DNA sequence: GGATTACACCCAAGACACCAGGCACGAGACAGAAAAAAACAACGAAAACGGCCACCACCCAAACACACCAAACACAAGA
């Protein structure tokens, strides 16, 4: 498994002033995704078929 | 009446529904409700007996008068 980067980690970055360091440990450490959106509704209803 | 009560990490151990009355269909019986007839109200037609005008005579009502009684100004008495 993975460590658990818990809330008062996050309370010590935000401290630090490390805002780049936070979003690449919340993001490309973890569970990052790519979801589209629909520009006018504002839901992630859109049908995306990338091929 | 609800709602919240440190943070991180390690390990082990058990279960990962079974079994029982309701829905459908599955058939009777008085009750939820429908059909009928006979004693209920009235009205048409005949019978004779109770109701209305006479006739009628005896009992209650009015007039006359009697004596009797209740009563009312006032001459007299009285404080
Ligand atoms: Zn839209």
Request: hydrophobic share 35%; net charge negative; aromatic share 0%.
């Given at each position: 498994g993975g460590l658990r980067f818990?809330?008062?980690e996050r309370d010590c970055m935000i401290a630090?002033?490390?805002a780049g360091f936070?979003?690449?440990r919340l993001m490309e450490a973890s569970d990052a995704f790519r979801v589209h959106v629909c520009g006018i509704c504002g839901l992630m209803s859109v049908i995306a078929n990338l091929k």
């Open positions: 818990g809330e008062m630090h002033g490390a936070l979003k690449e």
